[PDB]
Structures are given as structure tokens and as C-alpha cells.
Design a protein around this motif. Structure first.
Motif, short mmCIF file in Angstrom:
data_model
loop_
_atom_site.label_atom_id
_atom_site.label_comp_id
_atom_site.label_asym_id
_atom_site.label_seq_id
_atom_site.Cartn_x
_atom_site.Cartn_y
_atom_site.Cartn_z
N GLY A 1 3.36 11.51 9.16
CA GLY A 1 3.91 10.85 8.04
C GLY A 1 3.20 9.55 7.71
O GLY A 1 2.78 8.80 8.62
N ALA B 1 -0.67 11.47 -1.51
CA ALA B 1 -1.56 10.67 -2.30
C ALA B 1 -2.95 11.33 -2.48
O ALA B 1 -3.50 11.33 -3.57
N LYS C 1 -7.43 6.13 3.82
CA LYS C 1 -7.25 4.65 3.66
C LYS C 1 -8.47 3.84 4.06
O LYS C 1 -8.34 2.71 4.54
N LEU D 1 -8.73 -0.02 3.25
CA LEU D 1 -7.96 -1.07 3.94
C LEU D 1 -8.80 -1.77 4.95
O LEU D 1 -9.62 -1.13 5.62
N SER E 1 -10.56 7.49 0.65
CA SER E 1 -9.47 6.65 0.14
C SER E 1 -8.87 7.30 -1.09
O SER E 1 -9.57 7.49 -2.08
N1 LIG Z 1 -4.35 1.49 0.40
C1 LIG Z 1 -4.14 2.82 0.52
N2 LIG Z 1 -2.88 3.28 0.60
C2 LIG Z 1 -2.66 4.61 0.71
C3 LIG Z 1 -3.77 5.53 0.74
N3 LIG Z 1 -3.26 6.75 0.84
C4 LIG Z 1 -1.91 6.63 0.90
N4 LIG Z 1 -1.58 5.32 0.81
C5 LIG Z 1 -0.25 4.77 0.88
O1 LIG Z 1 0.39 5.15 2.13
C6 LIG Z 1 1.76 5.48 1.87
C7 LIG Z 1 2.04 6.93 2.27
O2 LIG Z 1 1.40 7.79 1.35
P1 LIG Z 1 1.81 9.32 1.27
O3 LIG Z 1 0.90 9.94 0.28
O4 LIG Z 1 3.29 9.44 1.08
O5 LIG Z 1 1.45 9.89 2.80
P2 LIG Z 1 2.13 11.21 3.45
O6 LIG Z 1 3.46 10.74 3.97
O7 LIG Z 1 1.18 11.66 4.53
O8 LIG Z 1 2.25 12.21 2.34
C8 LIG Z 1 1.99 5.26 0.37
O9 LIG Z 1 2.57 4.00 0.15
C9 LIG Z 1 0.61 5.31 -0.24
O10 LIG Z 1 0.47 4.49 -1.43
C10 LIG Z 1 -5.10 4.98 0.63
O11 LIG Z 1 -6.11 5.70 0.64
N5 LIG Z 1 -5.22 3.66 0.54
#
Ligand SMILES: Nc1nc2c(ncn2[C@@H]2O[C@H](COP(=O)(O)OP(=O)(O)O)[C@@H](O)[C@H]2O)c(=O)[nH]1
Ligand SMILES: [Mg+2]
Length: 156
Positions: A13, A19, A105, A108, A133
Motif C-alpha cells: 500500500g 497513480a 517516486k 522524491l 515517477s
Molecule cells: N511524489 C510522488 N508521489 C506519489 C507517486 N506515486 C504515488 N504518489 C503518492 O503516494 C500516495 C499513494 O499513491 P497510490 O497511487 O494510492 O498508491 P497505491 O496505494 O499503491 O495504489 C498518493 O498520495 C500519491 O499521490 C510519485 O511518483 N511521486
């Protein structure tokens, strides 16, 4: 007509599976957040990607390729990859399943997993490693395209 590719994005998670997927489909980044479809041309073959972002164990058994996603700023997510991969190994009854390791990410600054660690891990499994990213869109097309090509390397 077209050609169907059933893909499965797995990982802990909060790593950015949704995303990433939303980025591939709709070309935007969402900060707060089922199965998706996208028509793409990849090497002159029109492809319909049938993509699950993780009673949907029938994608696990039928899915032809897996994006194994961790975040570069989440050491726990990186360590968990072993378990997601062992799950896919058990379901497919083989150590040769189309797979890409994704380090998400990359924008970051707080990087706790080094590219060498990721490369060590991918090299042991015999799979590609790609840094992404979902925010900048760096690597995203390449992760999905490479997984498509990995699936092609294993059967028609
Ligand atoms: N800065 C940044 N934030 C990200 C990236 N990918 C996801 N996030 C953030 O990480 C959090 C979880 O993203 P999500 O897509 O729900 O991940 P999941 O739970 O694996 O589906 C969210 O607040 C996204 O905006 C990224 O490549 N860069
Ligand atoms: Mg999600």
C-alpha cells in the motif's frame, strides 16, 4: 483484430500502483485515491491492455505479466517485494513469469533504497528494473511497454 495483454500491478500500500496506472490511462497525477483498459501501439502491434491495480484472484491466475512496484523512499515496500513475487511464483507454479520490478517516486528527495539494491534484486530474479515517477511521468510508459515485451518473450 487487436491483441489483449492482461497485466497486474502488485506491491505494498502507498507505493503508487494506482497513480502509475492512472498516469498510463489518463496522463495526470492524483494525490488522493478495479480494472482498466487502454489501447496502445507498441512496436507496430495495436494492444489492448487489461490492467488490474491490486475475489479478483482470477487476474492472479490468468494475468500474463506483473508490475512489482515499490517506492524508492519506502524501504519496507522494497523488502516486501520478495513476498509479492513468491505469491506470483506459487500461483503460476514456475520461476519464469513475465515480470518487471518498478521503483516508483523517483522525484522524491528522501531516497532510502539505492539503485544498486534494486538492480541486485532484479538481477537475482532475472527481470528488468525500471525507475518511475507517476508525478513527472518518468519511466511510466517504459515500465508498461517493457512488461508487454517481457510477456512476448515468453510465448506468443
Ligand atoms: N511524489 C510522488 N508521489 C506519489 C507517486 N506515486 C504515488 N504518489 C503518492 O503516494 C500516495 C499513494 O499513491 P497510490 O497511487 O494510492 O498508491 P497505491 O496505494 O499503491 O495504489 C498518493 O498520495 C500519491 O499521490 C510519485 O511518483 N511521486
Ligand atoms: Mg490503489
Amino acid at each position: 483484430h487487436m491483441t489483449e495483454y492482461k497485466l497486474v500491478v502488485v506491491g505494498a500500500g502507498g507505493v503508487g500502483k494506482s497513480a502509475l496506472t492512472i498516469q498510463l490511462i489518463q496522463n495526470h497525477f492524483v494525490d488522493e485515491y478495479d480494472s482498466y483498459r487502454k489501447q496502445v501501439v507498441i512496436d507496430g502491434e495495436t494492444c489492448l491492455l487489461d490492467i488490474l491495480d491490486t475475489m479478483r484472484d482470477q487476474y492472479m491466475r490468468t494475468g500474463e505479466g506483473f508490475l512489482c512496484v515499490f517506492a524508492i523512499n519506502n524501504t519496507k515496500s522494497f523488502e516486501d517485494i520478495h513476498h509479492y513475487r513468491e505469491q506470483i511464483k506459487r500461483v503460476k507454479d514456475s520461476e519464469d513469469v513475465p515480470m518487471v520490478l518498478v521503483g516508483n517516486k523517483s522525484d522524491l528527495p528522501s531516497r532510502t533504497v539505492d539503485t544498486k539494491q534494486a538492480q541486485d534484486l532484479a538481477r537475482s530474479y532475472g527481470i528488468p528494473f525500471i525507475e518511475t515517477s507517476a508525478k513527472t511521468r518518468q519511466g511510466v510508459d517504459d515500465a508498461f511497454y517493457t512488461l508487454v515485451r517481457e510477456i512476448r518473450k515468453h510465448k506468443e
